[PDB]
């Protein structure tokens, strides 16, 4: 079996010609050639079985991705794992090859307004489908937006996703920069948190820098307040947790920084939409369908070509309590359909 950067990829004979793309906490992704369909693919090696949370996130990702079918959401084409549960130490997820992601792209080049508009459209088109399935992604960020050379965009990594149907994000080790204010104020389960993240992504496309790069929960909140200014009394009155409300009330007043000052080269319609996504009050924050219908995206908006899920997504089990041995059993069962 071919080795990549000191890791054995047992994907042959079907998959060969492997080269490193990126890596996470418990996985590495590579470009590869599929000798059967004569096409270039991406293969993700996942080794989660010694860690309960890795198992949970892996199971969630697999279940969601196998159920979802949308042009702007990464699919799973094949899964490679061992014929027996004891032998299974690694899982290989085969997906469509996406050459890069928005994180890497923004590190290397400034985007034209045309690209920003088209990318935003696809993000929101994908998100419309996710939300129509009653799923919250919860971890939208540039590195979770996969891109190819022809400007197709696919949302990935549903490891932290949840169904909005009655888990705290502040209990996970993850980038906090794209998190809605209500999350730090200790509240984390409306569709509106995803819209905030998209707003943060838009801001990042406009300037090539994260708008709110907080280092901890209080810093994250303070970064947001630095730009939006202190919330109005009206918006304070909508914060249900009194401690959080009184904390915000107590801070020295901060004036809003106007968006056109932060982003002096941005399209004015783009900043209008940005404002509506980066709205402090989650009830007043724009919804995904309303965002798609915004004048900035008029070039692409077409509700008859923006499909929805035909049924709400549901987890058949509570995963958060399960020991990693049981989670492994469930991963084994879920991947069985790809076995001969």
């Amino acid at each position: 079996p071919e080795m990549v950067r000191g890791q054995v990829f047992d994907v042959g004979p079907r998959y060969t010609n492997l080269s490193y793309i990126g890596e996470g906490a418990y996985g590495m992704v590579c470009s590869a050639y599929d000798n059967l369909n004569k096409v270039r693919v991406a293969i993700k090696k996942i080794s989660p079985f010694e860690h309960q949370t890795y198992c949970q996130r892996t199971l969630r990702e697999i279940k969601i991705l196998l159920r979802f079918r949308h042009e702007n959401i990464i699919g799973i084409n094949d899964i490679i794992r061992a014929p027996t549960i004891e032998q299974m130490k690694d899982v290989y997820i085969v997906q469509d090859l996406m050459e890069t992601d928005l994180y890497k792209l923004l590190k290397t080049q400034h985007l034209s307004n045309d690209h920003i508009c088209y990318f935003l459209y696809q993000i929101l088109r994908g998100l419309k489908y996710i939300h129509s399935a009653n799923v919250l992604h919860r971890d939208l960020k540039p590195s979770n937006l996969l891109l190819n050379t022809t400007c197709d965009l696919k949302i990935c990594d549903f490891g932290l996703a949840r169904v909005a149907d009655p888990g705290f994000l502040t209990e996970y080790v993850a980038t906090r920069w794209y998190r809605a204010p209500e999350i730090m104020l200790n509240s984390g389960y409306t569709k509106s948190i995803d819209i905030w993240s998209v707003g943060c992504i838009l801001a990042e496309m406009l300037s090539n820098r994260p708008i709110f790069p907080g280092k901890h929960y209080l810093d994250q909140l303070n970064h947001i307040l630095g730009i939006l200014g202190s919330p109005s009394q009206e918006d304070l009155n909508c914060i249900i947790n009194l401690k959080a409300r009184n904390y915000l009330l107590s801070l020295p007043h901060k004036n809003k920084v106007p968006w056109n000052r932060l982003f002096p080269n941005a399209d004015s319609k783009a900043l209008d939409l940005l404002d509506k996504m980066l709205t402090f009050n989650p009830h007043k924050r724009i919804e995904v369908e309303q965002a798609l219908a915004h004048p900035y995206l008029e070039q692409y908006y077409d509700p008859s070509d923006e499909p929805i899920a035909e049924a709400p997504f549901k987890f058949d089990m509570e995963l958060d309590d399960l020991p990693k041995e049981k989670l492994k059993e469930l991963i084994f069962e879920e991947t069985a359909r790809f076995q001969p």
Partner: peptide, 8 residues
Amino acid sequence: RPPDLWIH
């Protein structure tokens, strides 16, 4: 759609 991306 906008033109292709030169990826580095």
